[PDB]
Design a protein around this ligand. Structure first.
Ligand SMILES: C[C@H](OP(=O)(O)OP(=O)(O)OP(=O)(O)OC[C@H]1O[C@@H](n2cnc3c(=O)[nH]c(N)nc32)[C@H](O)[C@@H]1O)c1ccccc1[N+](=O)[O-]
Ligand SMILES: *CC(=O)N(C)CCN(C)c1ccc([N+](=O)[O-])c2nonc12
Ligand SMILES: [Mg+2]
Length: 166
């Protein structure tokens, strides 16, 4: 196959486990579980191409370590997720982006910025500001809900399109 190796990164509670379980299994979860399953794999068709996604769902309240580096370094593209009702998570995006670049030892990594939990009202992270963030880094910005499935495909499939183009 062409495999696409995706790593989903970002802060505690942002919806990384849920976004991926929604893509790999087509259902929504809700369960305070810091465990991280082996990689999620799924043959899919993206823009007509049959391919294997292999998605590493990582941990949110974890400091950088060699162990985390050991897991992350195999990824080809990175989904950088915050929650639109969590300002800390959006600000932490800078760290996560900078961490990814250092781990991959590269000035140009395929990434997509994802603002998750779009179904929730009274958002705190202004949409325009995430677009400006994503723009200033030169990456796509997708808004998602692991709950309603809005954007879950756009977000991930765009990340595959960024791998192809790098
Ligand atoms: C330890 C773990 O930290 P974590 O594993 O780093 O956290 P995740 O980023 O994987 O977070 P998860 O996907 O489990 O989603 C967190 C909570 O928000 C809910 N959620 C996820 N996406 C959405 C969405 O789009 N909309 C709505 N309305 N809700 C959503 C989930 O059902 C869950 O209750 C963790 C940290 C903080 C909080 C929870 C948590 N957890 O395990 O559940
Ligand atoms: C599901 C879960 O998070 N736990 C079992 C850990 C204990 N709890 C309930 C916990 C830990 C940490 C934080 N936090 O610092 O954000 C919590 N906030 O609400 N419950 C928390
Ligand atoms: Mg999780």
């Amino acid at each position: 196959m062409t495999e696409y190796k995706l790593v989903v990164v970002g802060a505690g509670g942002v919806g990384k486990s849920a976004l991926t379980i929604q893509l790999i299994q087509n259902h929504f979860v809700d369960e305070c579980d810091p465990t991280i399953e082996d990689s999620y794999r799924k043959q899919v068709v993206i823009d007509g191409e049959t391919c294997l996604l292999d998605i590493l769902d990582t941990a949110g309240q974890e400091e950088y370590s060699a162990m985390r580096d050991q897991y992350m370094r195999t990824g080809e593209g990175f989904l950088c997720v915050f929650a639109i009702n969590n300002t800390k998570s959006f600000e932490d995006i800078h760290q996560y982006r900078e961490q990814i670049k250092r781990v991959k030892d590269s000035d140009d990594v395929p990434m997509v910025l994802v603002g998750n939990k779009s179904d929730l009202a009274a958002r705190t992270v202004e949409s325009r500001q995430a677009q400006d963030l994503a723009r200033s880094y030169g990456i796509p910005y997708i808004e998602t809900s692991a709950k309603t499935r809005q954007g879950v495909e756009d977000a991930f499939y765009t990340l595959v399109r960024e791998i192809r183009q790098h």
